[model samples]
Target: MVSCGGGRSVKNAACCAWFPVLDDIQANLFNGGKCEEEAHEAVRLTFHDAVGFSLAAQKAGKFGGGGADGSILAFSDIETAFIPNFGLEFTTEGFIPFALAHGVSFGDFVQFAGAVGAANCAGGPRLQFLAGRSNISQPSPDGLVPDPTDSADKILARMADIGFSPTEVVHLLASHSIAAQYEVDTDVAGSPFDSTPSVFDTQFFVESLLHGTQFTGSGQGGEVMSPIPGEFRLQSDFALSRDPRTACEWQALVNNQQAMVNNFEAVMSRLAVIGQIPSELVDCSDVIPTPPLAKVAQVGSLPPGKSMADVQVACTNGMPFPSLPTSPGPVQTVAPVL
Candidate 1:
């Protein structure tokens, strides 16, 4: 065991050494705790890395891939060479320097960076960070990551293979609250998933349920109809929101601030340790910063021009869908991140 200063101690001394490096990562890479392009990409990277595992293939004694391993970076040339992992090069390459500089394992840095990035976003949760991942990595088998165009059934099945339940998958989708789609449409390169892209809130859950009226960009592959102008929607997200299997949890998250944050943190913590033994890893969660709460008044309200009528209420459990006040103004237009 080793002390990481300030009375914090970790089981692995090597893990404790990351304390200062995390400080550097927060100050430099995250731009002093502001959520921006790099921060969004870092959060995206964690999911891509962890979702590469396949239980069926692993049981077959094949190269099913290491869950949450930084193989995407360690074997960048091989992993990023594929279609499913396209556009991850920016984040993968960006993290290499930090990983090398601190002698940290690629896997650990990938997960750690993601946790830090997520926490820095306004209204984001402080995710638990684990350390002690192996540096050695192998290329994950192709086609494990879910495509945006995948059907609800296929997406649910794929997530199940990676050990996420339908509801858990809904919880994980909360990342989209602060995410942008870079490659979905080159014309609108940084189109965000919601109106309040920089703030982590229930706006994403609320907005996604609204009917998609038009396309924001070139309507390219993986792009779907969006409720608000200048925002992007994933076909998979749209389908899952209305699907019988996951709709309840999807609607349940709408306007429920505490549940969304709690559920998201819980699933993210689970995702970070997909292939490792939790008991063997050191919890370095204290190193992650607590992000500022999203503007409370900004949450639980429909974007301007969106009425309760626009919502496709999928949860029919007799509890009335939470009534939300609509923002007063013209049709809300979400600005692209960059």
Candidate 2:
């Protein structure tokens, strides 16, 4: 539906000078705008991976973890860049088309799908991705993150702004235990979450359950209801948290408060590859190989069935949470986005 549309935003106007209008159109689609079915082919080529400016398909070729934004070193870089728009999500828009372009084999969709999963792994109740994917012929749009002022359900609706399911809403939230928001919207209820926002644990679930939440601060849950009582983030979360269809998934993390990491990883692996397109159909010349230099090095490395407390003793010297102590100050910058 988005083949070279007729309008432009401030960003479209600015980028138009360096790139073609078609490029912007393709990008707009990737950014969750619109394009017709034929437009999908265009997005396939145009979307660019915002992370380190790597090529989308290449990154998919190699296994990459979505939680890289929380790295102290990465955060430090964002802070120092002195660039406007600092949220980690800022880098993901417009890449969906590119992911599709690489071909929608189960392997390829995995990256696109994992992106949604990863977004939830971000900081709040929101999981920023939808499924009705399209492809573009040129680089997708750049810069334009949504607002956090929204309540939990409001945030979920915003996430579904593209297209996500009820199960996905909760699955994505499972990843939330990992990072904290680089930016904050105090207006939203239960914000900034727990003080250890950076730690990435079940605490997010536990505490959120404790504080309860409001819908976009106004007190209404979105189609995906907020998971907590009286909570209003995603109606899906509220429904699935205890509803017959999805309660088991929620209990796996929020209730058990453990084993979540494993479940998230497995689900994420599948989420990344929901739909598949054959690669033979598209041009690969433009694709940049954004390979993951290394596997995430395994977090909380421990023998199975071992508790974190036990792992802490033996591998306490080892760290899933590492900082640049040898360097100095504020622990380390997570990346100064915005």
Candidate 3:
């Protein structure tokens, strides 16, 4: 019989082994129930670790890298040296000790940490956690990760190469709601993607739809036009929001809170197992902590100073764009997370 200390029992008793380890990571590494930089980095790390595999490239007889195999953590020296992976050394090195101490495979711990990190953010969904990935991994080929400067067509094609649909790509981009960029502009480090960087809400989707009025930081190399002052926008995010192929799905999520959460969870679950077999893994979702509901209100209206004229609505079909009331005040300026 499998025993989880303190009388906790899960359906897959084999998975019960992870209960205490998760507790320790949550209580210690996650800032003791606080959702902050470490939590955001963990969530971002999952994508960097998992999205390296490409079935199309592998079929073409090229090294496509092991997807979701914890290769980033195992061979960090080789992977982090790539240009796109810059600035992740902090996160990669930080997680190594936990994996060794807990005796969990790097693959399992990387994905599990992502689930816990996302849930730590208020209003974030409880992502499904699976265990059983082997520790063995190889460095992913360079240029697999999409660049912020890429065109919509190129980005879509790249994601498709990895087996993700246009809609799914949009769903995954929702992670930017709580993401920040450091190397994009070291001058303005810690610039948040959305006005509400701490809360996992639909504000990013809404804010991204607004007209690009200005830029933050050095205004070059990964920096794009931003709607709100002091907010950072990736060119790919701006293009995807208006691209006909993904815009409908992107616009549809603007005010739909439940849809955002459900879609994100579904896509992330699929993403976390790109190169692994699901049947071999045990579902240990029960071990993840429940995040608090977002304390902020849903995006009911555009921020002050933004008008319908500024909105570039690409979904002109049955799904009518939402009409939100404007907050009465001057245009809002987002403060840096530092």
Model 2, range 186-210, lDDT digits (tens) per residue?
2442322222232334543443332
Using TM-score, give the best candidate's number: 3
Displacement of residue 34 (Cα, Å) in model 1 is: 1.2
- Per-residue C-alpha lDDT of model 1 across residues 35-87, encoded as one tens digit per residue: 88878888888988898799989789887888988888898888887786787
TM-score of 2: 0.33
Residue 286, model 2, lDDT: 15
| TM-score of each model, paired residue for residue | 0.94, 0.33, 0.95
Off by over 4 Å in 3: 1-3, 293-300
Give per-candidate clash totals: 0, 53, 2
The CA root-mean-square deviation of candidate 2, after full C-alpha superposition on the true structure, stands at 17.3
Model 1 quality (TM-score)? 0.94
Q: Write the per-residue lDDT of candidate 3 for residues 173-239, one digit (tens) a residue.
A: 8899888888889888888988877788888888898888899876887677898888998888998
What are the clashing pairs of model 3?
300-324, 301-324
